[PDB]
Coordinates of N, CA and C in Angstrom, one line a residue:
X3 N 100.4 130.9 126.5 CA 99.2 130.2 126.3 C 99.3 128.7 126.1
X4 N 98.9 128.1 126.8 CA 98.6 126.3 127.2 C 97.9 126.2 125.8
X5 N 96.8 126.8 125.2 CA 96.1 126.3 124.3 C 96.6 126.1 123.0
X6 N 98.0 126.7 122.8 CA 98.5 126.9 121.7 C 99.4 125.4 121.6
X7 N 99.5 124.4 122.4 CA 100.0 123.4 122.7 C 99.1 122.3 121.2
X8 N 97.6 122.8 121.2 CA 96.9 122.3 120.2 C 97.3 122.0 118.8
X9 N 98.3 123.3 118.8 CA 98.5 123.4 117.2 C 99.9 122.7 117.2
X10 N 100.6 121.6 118.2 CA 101.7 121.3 117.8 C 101.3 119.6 117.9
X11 N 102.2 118.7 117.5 CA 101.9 117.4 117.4 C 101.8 116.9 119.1
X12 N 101.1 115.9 119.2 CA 100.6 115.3 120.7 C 101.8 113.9 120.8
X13 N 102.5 114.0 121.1 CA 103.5 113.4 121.2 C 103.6 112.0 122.7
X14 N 102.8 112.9 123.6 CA 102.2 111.7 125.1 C 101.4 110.6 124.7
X15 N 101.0 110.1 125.9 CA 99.8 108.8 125.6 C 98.6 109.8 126.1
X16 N 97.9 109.2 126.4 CA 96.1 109.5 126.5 C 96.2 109.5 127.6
X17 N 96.6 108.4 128.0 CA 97.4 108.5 129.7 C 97.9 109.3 130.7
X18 N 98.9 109.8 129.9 CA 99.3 111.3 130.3 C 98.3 112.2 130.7
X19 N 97.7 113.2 129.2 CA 97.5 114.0 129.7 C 96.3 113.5 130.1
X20 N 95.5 112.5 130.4 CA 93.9 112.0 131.3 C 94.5 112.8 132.8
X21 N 95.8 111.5 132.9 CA 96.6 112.5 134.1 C 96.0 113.4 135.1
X22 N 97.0 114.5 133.9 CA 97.1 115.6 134.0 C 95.6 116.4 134.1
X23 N 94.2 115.8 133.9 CA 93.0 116.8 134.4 C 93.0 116.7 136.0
X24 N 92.7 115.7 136.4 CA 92.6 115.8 138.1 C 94.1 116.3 139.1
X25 N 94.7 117.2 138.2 CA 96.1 117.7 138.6 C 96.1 119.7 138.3
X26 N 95.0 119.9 137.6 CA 95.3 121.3 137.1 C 93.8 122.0 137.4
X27 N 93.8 122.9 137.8 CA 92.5 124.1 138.4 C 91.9 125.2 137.6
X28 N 92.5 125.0 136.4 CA 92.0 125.7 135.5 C 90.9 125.2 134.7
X29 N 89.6 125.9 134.7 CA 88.9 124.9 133.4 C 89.6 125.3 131.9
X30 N 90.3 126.3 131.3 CA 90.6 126.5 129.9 C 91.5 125.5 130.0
X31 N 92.3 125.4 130.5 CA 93.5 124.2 130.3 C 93.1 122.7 130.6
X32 N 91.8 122.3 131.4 CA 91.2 121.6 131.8 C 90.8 120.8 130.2
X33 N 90.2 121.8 129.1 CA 89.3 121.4 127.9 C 90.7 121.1 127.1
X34 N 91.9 122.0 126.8 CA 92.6 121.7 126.0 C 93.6 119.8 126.5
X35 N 93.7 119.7 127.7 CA 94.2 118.3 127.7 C 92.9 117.3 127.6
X36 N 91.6 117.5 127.4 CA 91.0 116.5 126.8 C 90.8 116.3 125.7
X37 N 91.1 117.7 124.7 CA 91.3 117.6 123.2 C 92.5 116.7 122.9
X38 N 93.7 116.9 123.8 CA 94.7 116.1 123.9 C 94.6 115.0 123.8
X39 N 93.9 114.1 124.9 CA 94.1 113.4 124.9 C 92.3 112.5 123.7
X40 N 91.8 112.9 123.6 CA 91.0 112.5 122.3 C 91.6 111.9 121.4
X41 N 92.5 113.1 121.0 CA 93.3 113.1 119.7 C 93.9 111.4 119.4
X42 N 94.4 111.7 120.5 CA 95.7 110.5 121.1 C 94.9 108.9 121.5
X43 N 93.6 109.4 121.5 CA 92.7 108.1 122.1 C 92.8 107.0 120.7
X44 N 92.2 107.9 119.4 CA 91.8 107.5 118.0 C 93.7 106.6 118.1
X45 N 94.4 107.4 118.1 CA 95.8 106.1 117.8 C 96.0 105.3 118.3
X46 N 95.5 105.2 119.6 CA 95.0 104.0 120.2 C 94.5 103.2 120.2
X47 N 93.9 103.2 119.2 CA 92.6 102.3 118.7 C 91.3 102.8 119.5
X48 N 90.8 103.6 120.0 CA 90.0 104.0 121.1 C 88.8 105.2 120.3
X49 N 88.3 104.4 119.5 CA 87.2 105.7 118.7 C 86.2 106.0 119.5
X50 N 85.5 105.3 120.2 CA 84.8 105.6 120.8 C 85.0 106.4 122.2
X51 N 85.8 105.7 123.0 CA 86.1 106.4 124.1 C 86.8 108.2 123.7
X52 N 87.3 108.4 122.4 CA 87.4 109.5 122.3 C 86.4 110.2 121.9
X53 N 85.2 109.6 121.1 CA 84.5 110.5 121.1 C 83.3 111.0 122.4
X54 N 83.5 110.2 123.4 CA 83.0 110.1 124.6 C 83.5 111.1 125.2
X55 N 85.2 111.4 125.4 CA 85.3 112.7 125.8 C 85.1 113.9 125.1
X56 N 84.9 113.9 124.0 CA 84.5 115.1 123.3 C 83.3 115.7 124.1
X57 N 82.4 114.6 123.8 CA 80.9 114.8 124.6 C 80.7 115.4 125.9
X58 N 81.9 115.4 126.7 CA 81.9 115.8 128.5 C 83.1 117.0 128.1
X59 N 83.1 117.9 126.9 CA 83.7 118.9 127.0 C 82.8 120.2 127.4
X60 N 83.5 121.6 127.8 CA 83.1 122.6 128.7 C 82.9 123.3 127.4
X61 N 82.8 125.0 128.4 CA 82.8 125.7 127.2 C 84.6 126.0 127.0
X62 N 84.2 126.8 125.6 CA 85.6 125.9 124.5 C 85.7 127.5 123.8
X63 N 87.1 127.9 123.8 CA 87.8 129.1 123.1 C 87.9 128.7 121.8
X64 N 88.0 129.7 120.9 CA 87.9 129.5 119.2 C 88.9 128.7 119.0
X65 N 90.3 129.0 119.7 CA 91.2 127.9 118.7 C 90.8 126.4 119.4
X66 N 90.2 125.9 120.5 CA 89.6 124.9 121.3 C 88.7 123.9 120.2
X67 N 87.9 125.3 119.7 CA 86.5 124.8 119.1 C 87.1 124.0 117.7
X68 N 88.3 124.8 117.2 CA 88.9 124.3 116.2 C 89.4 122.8 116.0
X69 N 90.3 122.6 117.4 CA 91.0 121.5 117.0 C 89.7 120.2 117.6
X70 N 88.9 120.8 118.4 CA 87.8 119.6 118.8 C 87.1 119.7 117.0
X71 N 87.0 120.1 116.3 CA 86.6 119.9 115.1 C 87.1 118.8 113.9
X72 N 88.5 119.2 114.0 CA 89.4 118.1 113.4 C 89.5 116.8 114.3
X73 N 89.1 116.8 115.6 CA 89.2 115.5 115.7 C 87.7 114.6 115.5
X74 N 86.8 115.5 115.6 CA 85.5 115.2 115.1 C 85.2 114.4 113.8
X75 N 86.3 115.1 112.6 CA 85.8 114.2 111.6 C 86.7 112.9 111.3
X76 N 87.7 113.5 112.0 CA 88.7 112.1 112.0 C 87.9 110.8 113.0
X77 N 87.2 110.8 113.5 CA 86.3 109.6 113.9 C 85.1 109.3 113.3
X78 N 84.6 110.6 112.7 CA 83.4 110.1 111.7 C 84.5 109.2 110.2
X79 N 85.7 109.4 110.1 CA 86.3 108.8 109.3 C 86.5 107.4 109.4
X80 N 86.8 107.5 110.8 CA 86.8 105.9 111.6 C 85.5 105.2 111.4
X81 N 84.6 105.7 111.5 CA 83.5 105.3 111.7 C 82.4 104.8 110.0
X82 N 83.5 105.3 109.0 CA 83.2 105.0 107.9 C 81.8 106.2 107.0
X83 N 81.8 107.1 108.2 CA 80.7 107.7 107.9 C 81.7 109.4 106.9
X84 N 81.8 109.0 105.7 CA 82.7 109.4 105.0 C 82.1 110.7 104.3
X85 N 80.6 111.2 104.1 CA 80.0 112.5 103.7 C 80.3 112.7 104.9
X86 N 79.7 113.0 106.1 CA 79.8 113.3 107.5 C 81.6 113.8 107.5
X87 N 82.7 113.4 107.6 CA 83.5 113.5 107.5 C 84.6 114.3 107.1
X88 N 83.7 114.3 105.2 CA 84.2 115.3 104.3 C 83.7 117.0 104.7
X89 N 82.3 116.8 105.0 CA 81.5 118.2 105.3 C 82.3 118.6 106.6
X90 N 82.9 117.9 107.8 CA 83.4 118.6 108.7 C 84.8 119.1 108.4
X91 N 85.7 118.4 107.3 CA 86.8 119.1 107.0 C 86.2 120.8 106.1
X92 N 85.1 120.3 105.4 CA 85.1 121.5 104.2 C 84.4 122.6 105.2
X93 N 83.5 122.3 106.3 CA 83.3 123.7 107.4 C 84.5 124.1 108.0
X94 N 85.9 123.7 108.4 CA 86.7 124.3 108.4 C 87.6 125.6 107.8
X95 N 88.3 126.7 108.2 CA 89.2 127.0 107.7 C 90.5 126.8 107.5
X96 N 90.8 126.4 106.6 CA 92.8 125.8 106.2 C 93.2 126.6 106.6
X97 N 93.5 127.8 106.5 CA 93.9 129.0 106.5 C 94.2 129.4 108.2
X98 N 93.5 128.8 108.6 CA 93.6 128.8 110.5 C 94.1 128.0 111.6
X99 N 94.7 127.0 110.5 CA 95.2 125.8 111.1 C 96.9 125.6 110.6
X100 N 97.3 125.2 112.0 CA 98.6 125.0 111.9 C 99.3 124.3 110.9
X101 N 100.8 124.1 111.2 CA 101.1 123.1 110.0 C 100.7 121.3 110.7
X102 N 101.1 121.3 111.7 CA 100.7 120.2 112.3 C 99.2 120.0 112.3
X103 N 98.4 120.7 112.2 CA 96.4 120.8 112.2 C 96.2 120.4 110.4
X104 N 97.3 121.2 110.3 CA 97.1 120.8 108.2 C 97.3 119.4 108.0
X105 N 98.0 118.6 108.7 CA 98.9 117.6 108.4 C 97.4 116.8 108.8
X106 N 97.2 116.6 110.1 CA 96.2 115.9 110.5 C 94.3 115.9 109.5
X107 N 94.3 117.2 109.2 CA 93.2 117.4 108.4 C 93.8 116.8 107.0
X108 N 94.4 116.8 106.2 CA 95.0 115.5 105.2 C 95.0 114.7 105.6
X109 N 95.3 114.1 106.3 CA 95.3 112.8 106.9 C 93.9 112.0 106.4
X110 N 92.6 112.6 107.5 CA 91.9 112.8 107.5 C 91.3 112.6 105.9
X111 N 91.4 113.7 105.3 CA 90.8 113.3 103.6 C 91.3 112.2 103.2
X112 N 92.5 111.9 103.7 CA 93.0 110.2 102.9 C 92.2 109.5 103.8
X113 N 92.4 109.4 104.5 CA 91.4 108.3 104.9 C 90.3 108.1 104.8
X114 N 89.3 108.7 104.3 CA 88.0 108.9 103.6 C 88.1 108.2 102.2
X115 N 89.4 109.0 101.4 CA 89.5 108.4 100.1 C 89.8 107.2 100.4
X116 N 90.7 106.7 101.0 CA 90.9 105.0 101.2 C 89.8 104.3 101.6
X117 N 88.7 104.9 102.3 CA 87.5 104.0 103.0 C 86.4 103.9 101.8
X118 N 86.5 105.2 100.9 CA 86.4 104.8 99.1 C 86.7 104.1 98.4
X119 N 87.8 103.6 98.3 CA 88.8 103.3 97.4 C 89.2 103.8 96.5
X120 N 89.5 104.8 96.5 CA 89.7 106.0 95.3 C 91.3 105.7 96.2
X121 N 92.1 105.1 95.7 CA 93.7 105.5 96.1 C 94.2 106.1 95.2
X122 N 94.2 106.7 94.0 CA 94.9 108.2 93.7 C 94.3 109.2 94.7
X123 N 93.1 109.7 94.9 CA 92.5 110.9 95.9 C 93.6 110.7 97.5
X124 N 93.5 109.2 98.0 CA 94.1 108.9 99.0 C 95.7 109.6 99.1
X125 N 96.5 109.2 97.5 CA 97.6 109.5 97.6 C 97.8 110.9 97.5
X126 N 96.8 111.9 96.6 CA 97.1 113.0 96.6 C 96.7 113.8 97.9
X127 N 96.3 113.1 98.7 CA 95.8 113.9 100.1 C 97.4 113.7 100.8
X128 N 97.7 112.6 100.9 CA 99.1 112.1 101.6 C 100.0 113.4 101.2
X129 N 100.0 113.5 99.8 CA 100.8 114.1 99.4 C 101.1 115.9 99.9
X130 N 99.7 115.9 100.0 CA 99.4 117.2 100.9 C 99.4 117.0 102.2
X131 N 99.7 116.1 102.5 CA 99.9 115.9 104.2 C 101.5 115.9 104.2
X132 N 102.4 115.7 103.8 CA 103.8 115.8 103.7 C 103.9 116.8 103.5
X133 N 103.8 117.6 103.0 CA 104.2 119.0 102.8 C 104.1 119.5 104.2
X134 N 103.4 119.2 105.0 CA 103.1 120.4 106.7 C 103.5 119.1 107.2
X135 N 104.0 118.2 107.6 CA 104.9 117.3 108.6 C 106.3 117.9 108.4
X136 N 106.8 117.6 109.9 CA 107.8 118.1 110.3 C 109.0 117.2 110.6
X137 N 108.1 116.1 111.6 CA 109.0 115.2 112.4 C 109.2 114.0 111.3
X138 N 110.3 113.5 110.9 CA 111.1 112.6 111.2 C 110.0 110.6 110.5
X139 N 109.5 110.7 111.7 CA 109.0 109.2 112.0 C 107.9 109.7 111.4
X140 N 107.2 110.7 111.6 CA 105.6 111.1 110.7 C 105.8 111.1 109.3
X141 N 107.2 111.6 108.8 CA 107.2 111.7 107.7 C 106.9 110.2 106.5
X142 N 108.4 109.6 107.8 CA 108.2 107.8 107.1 C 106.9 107.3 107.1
X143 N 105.9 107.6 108.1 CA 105.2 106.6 108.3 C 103.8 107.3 107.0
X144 N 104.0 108.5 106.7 CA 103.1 108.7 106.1 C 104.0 108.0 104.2
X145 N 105.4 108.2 104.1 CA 105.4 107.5 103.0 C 105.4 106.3 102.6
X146 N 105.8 105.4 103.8 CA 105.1 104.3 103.7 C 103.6 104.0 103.8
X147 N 102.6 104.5 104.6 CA 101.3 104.4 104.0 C 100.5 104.9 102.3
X148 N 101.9 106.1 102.0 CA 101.7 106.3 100.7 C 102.0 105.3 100.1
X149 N 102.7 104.7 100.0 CA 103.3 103.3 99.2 C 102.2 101.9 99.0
X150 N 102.1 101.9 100.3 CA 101.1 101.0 101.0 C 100.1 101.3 99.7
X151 N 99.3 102.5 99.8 CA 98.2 102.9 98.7 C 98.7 102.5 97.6
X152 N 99.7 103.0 96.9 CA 99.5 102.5 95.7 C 100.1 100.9 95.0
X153 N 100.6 100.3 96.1 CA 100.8 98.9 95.9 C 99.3 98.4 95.6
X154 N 98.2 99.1 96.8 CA 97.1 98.6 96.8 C 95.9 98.4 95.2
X155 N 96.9 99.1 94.6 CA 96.2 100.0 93.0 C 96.2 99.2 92.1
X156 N 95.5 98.3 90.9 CA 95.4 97.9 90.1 C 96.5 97.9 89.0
X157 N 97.2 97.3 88.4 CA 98.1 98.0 87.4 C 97.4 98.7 86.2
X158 N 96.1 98.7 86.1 CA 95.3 99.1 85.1 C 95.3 100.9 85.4
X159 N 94.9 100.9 86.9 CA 94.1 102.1 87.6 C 96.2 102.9 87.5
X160 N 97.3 102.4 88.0 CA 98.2 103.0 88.2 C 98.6 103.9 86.4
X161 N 98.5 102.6 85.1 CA 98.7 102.9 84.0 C 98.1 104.2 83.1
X162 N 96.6 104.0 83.9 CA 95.8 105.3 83.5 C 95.8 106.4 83.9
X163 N 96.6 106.8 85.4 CA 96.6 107.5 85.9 C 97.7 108.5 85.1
X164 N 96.9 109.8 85.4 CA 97.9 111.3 84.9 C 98.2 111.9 86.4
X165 N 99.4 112.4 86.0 CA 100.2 113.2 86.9 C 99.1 114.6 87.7
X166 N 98.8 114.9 86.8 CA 98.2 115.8 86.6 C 98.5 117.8 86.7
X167 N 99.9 117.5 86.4 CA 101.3 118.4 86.6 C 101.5 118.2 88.1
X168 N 101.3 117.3 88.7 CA 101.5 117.4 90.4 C 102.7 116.9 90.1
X169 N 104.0 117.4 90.3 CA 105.6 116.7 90.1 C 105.6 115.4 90.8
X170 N 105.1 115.6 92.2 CA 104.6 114.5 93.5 C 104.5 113.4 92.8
X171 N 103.0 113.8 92.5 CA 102.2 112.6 92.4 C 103.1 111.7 90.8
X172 N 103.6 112.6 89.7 CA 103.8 112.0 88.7 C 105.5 111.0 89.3
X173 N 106.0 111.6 90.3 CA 107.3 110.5 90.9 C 106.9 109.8 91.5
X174 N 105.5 109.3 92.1 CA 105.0 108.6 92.7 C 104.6 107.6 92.0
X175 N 103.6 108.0 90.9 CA 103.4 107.2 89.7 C 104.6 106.4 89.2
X176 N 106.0 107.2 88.9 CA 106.5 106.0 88.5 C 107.5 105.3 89.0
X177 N 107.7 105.5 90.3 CA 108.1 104.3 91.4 C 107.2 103.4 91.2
X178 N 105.9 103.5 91.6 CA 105.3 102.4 91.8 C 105.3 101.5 90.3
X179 N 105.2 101.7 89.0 CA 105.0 101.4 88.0 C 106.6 100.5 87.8
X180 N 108.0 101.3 88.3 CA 108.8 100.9 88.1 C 109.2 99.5 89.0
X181 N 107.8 99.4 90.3 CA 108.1 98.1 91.3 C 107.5 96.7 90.4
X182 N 106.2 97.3 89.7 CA 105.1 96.5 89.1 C 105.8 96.2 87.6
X183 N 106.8 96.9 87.3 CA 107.5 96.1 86.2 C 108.6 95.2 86.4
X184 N 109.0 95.0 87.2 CA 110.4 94.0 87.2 C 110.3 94.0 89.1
X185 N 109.2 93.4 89.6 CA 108.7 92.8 90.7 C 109.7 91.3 90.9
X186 N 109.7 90.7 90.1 CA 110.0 89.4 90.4 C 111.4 89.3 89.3
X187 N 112.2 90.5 89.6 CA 113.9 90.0 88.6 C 114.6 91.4 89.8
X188 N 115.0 90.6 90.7 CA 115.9 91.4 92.3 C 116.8 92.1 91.5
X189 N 117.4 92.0 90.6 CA 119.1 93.1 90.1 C 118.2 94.3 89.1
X190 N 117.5 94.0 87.9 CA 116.9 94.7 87.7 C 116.3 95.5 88.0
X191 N 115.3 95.1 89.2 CA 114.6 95.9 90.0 C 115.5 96.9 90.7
X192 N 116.6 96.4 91.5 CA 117.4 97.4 92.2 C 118.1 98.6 91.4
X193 N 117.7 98.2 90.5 CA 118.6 99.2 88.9 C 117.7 100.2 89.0
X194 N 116.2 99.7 88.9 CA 115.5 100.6 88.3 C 115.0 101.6 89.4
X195 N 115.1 101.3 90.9 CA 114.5 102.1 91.9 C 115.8 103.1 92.2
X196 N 117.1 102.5 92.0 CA 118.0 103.3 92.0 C 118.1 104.2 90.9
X197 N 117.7 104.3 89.8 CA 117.8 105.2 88.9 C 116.3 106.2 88.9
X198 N 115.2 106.0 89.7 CA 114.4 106.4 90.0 C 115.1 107.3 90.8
X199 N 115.5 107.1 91.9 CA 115.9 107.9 93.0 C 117.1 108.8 92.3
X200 N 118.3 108.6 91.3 CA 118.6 109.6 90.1 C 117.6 110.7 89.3
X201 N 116.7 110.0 88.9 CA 115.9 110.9 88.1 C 114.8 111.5 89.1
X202 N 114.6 111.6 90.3 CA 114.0 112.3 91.3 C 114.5 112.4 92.5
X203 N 115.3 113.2 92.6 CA 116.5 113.3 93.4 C 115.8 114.1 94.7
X204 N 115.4 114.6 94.7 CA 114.5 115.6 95.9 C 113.4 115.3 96.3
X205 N 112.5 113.9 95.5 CA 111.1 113.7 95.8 C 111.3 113.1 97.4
X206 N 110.0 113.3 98.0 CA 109.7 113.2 99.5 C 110.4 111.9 99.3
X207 N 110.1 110.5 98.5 CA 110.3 109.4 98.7 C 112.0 108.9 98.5
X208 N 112.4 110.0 97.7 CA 113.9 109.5 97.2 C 115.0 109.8 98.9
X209 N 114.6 110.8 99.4 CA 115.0 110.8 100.9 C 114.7 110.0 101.7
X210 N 113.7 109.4 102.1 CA 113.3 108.5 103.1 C 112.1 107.5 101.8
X211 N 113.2 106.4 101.7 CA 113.0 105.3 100.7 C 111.5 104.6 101.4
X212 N 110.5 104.3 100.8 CA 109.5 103.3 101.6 C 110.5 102.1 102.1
X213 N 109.9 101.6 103.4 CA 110.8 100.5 103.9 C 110.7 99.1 103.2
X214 N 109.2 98.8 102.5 CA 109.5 98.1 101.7 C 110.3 97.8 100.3
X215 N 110.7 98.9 100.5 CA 111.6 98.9 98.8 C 112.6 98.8 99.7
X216 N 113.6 99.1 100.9 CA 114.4 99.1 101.3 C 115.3 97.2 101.3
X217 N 114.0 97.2 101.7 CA 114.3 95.6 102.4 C 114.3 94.7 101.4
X218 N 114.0 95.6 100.2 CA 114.2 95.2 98.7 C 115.9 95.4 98.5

């Protein structure tokens, strides 16, 4: 099954598989490389021309209708239209989606929360987006955008914040608190993110360090 290609990460350009329609005689395989390439449009910077091809899609098999769903609200996300967005993830079923579909649908809620500004919601979606990533460079790039969030956070909004028994979220909490305390004293500081990474030896972040603490 070609369609099952849906449920793994899109790894080509837009380019590719555009390609690839005036190359294949199938209409089912026809619809899944323009979900493909949609997908792939939004990383592009290209919200609209992806949602353009959504619009010139055929008829569409259940797992089809699915992933053209998740990429639906991931442009109403782009598009800042954030109820719109949320209602298309919550008509979904989790339960029917891959790990890589889970990954992207978190995504998705974070970036809603961030077009909010609710960056705990942001971070705890990330956080649930890490869990179903697989690859490598997704991983980084989503902990550095975690990072990113809570750099963005108030020290007021970080100080109030509860874990909320989320182990995650409370090692996340106090990395960032331990950047915001001794920011500007470099040997200290290196003390304290190294003894972070001691005292949370397994967290997503203590394996693949944010790069700005690295370069720290």
């Amino acid at each position: 099954n070609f369609t099952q290609t849906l449920q793994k990460d899109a790894n080509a350009s837009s380019e590719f598989y555009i390609n690839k329609l005036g190359q294949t005689q199938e209409l089912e395989d026809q619809q899944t490389y323009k979900l493909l390439a949609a997908r792939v449009l939004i990383r592009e910077n290209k919200v609209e021309q992806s949602a353009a091809l959504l619009r010139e899609l055929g008829e569409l098999n259940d797992a089809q209708k699915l992933d053209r769903a998740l990429i639906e609200a991931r442009i109403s996300a782009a598009k800042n239209a954030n109820e719109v967005a949320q209602n298309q993830l919550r008509a979904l079923d989790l339960n029917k989606l891959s790990p890589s579909q889970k990954s992207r649908y978190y995504e998705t809620l974070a970036i809603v929360a961030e077009n909010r500004k609710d960056m705990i919601e942001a971070v705890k979606a990330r956080i649930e987006m890490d869990k179903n990533l697989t690859d490598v460079q997704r991983h980084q790039d989503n902990i550095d955008k975690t990072w990113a969030l809570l750099r963005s956070a108030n020290t007021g909004v970080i100080n109030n914040a509860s874990d909320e028994g989320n182990a995650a979220l409370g090692g996340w909490l106090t990395l960032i608190k331990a950047y915001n305390d001794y920011i500007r004293q470099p040997v200290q500081l290196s003390q304290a993110l190294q003894s972070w990474k001691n005292a949370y030896p397994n967290h997503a972040a203590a394996t693949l360090f944010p790069k700005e603490l690295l370069t720290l």
